[PDB]
Amino acid sequence: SKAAADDFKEAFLLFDRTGDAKITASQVGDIARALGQNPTNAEINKILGNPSKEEMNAAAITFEEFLPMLQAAANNKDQGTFEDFVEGLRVFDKEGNGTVMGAELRHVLATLGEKMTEEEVEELMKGQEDSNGCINYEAFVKHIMSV
């Protein structure tokens, strides 16, 4: 709305590697996340196809399409409730203390639903899981929602 945030246009100049002021359709998922929006990858996929837009063939962009797609994704930020994120992992391990065994969270984050690479899974556990093999998800989900 501007509140006209012109820093979204300045961040589009940091993600366009050619400097022509266009951003390919394959970068739009990760740049919506870098502007403070977490649409799921199936949602980013649907919307695209919904608009008869094929992410399979070469794509370019213009700021005039990327701005309204970020504004259509911005209504879905009401789905980001931290009660359900901590209660999900509290149902994932027994006893009254928030600890996932290391390999349980790593294999679930790579193979269940939207596949996260094991390189990204190791980069998200690095520091929050110590050598006991127990990830405290009270501080883990706190630090994941700090970015």
Added chain:
Amino acid sequence: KLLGGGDVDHTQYAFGHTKVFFKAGLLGLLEEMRDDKLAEIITATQARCRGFLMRVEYRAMVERRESIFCIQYNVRSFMNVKHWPWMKLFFKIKPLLK
């Protein structure tokens, strides 16, 4: 452990000493509804993750920014130098030093 995943009704089944028990076609119906309900619940929980996942990649990419350059330029030098008289000289000589 397997049933851990899936946007499936975690109700409709039941385990026991030699086997699992499963509904169809009602309980079958239940689950289905359930299934959709996790895509929601799930699909949404996936996203953030996905999102978040790459959000850490940027923090790494960025860190890396210079360490590369350092590496980048640094090599190039050598490729140029290693063929230079003066540099070979310094090389044989570099040891006699203290």
Added chain:
Amino acid sequence: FDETEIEDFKEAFTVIDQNADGIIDKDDLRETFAAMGRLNVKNEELDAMIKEASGPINFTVFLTMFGEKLKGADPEDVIMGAFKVLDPDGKGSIKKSFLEELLTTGGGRFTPEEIKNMWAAFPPDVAGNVDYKNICYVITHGEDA
């Protein structure tokens, strides 16, 4: 340029300047090469070294000539710093295909053709990205050790 690296270039300047007056002339170049075993060092090699400078080779002209050729020179401790961040679990030499993918996909300086030249005298282990450390040695001091 760290100060111990500048003191190493001051010691190399004193070993090539055998007249000890502060300016390496062509006679100093030839007598340093003859003391290393080069009895056949041509005058055209000495003239090509002097043709890289605009004036006499005093200590600051030798430092500026080496600065302009070594604009990406990195000491062994900072190269091992970056390779310990690439192998953050320690000890292991990193895979060949991991260094080829990460050089290309991050930067234009890590493009492939250049990666074939990296494997080409930096041998297999070095090239591959498995060993480590010998490449830091030969980037700070060239030729086979």
Added chain:
Amino acid sequence: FDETEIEDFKEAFTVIDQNADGIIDKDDLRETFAAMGRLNVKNEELDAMIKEASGPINFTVFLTMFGEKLKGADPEDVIMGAFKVLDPDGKGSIKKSFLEELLTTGGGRFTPEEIKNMWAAFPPDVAGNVDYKNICYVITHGEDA
């Protein structure tokens, strides 16, 4: 301030005061930095060092300025004294979680956030509280050794 530490500051005062008159002026600061390899040392850095004093930098003004910045400076033998009392059986570097709990639970200076900053350049072993001794080195003489 022990007397050998004051003699170390007298030797550092004589190496920065290259005019040997007893007062470090801005020309001494610039010529000591140029002799360490700093050819690009700006005049604003020299002015910010002189702006920390109310008068000329003689030996007692340099000692009082260093005293007021190092009001908790501890020599390496007293830091190893305290770490030998934390590891009273000798040899072993103490656990990471033991130093985090004992810093917090005894004092307010050992609060966590500060403990994350301790781990942050004082690396793992140091941060963790396992090694020992390298942290005493870098507290008496900074930067990576």
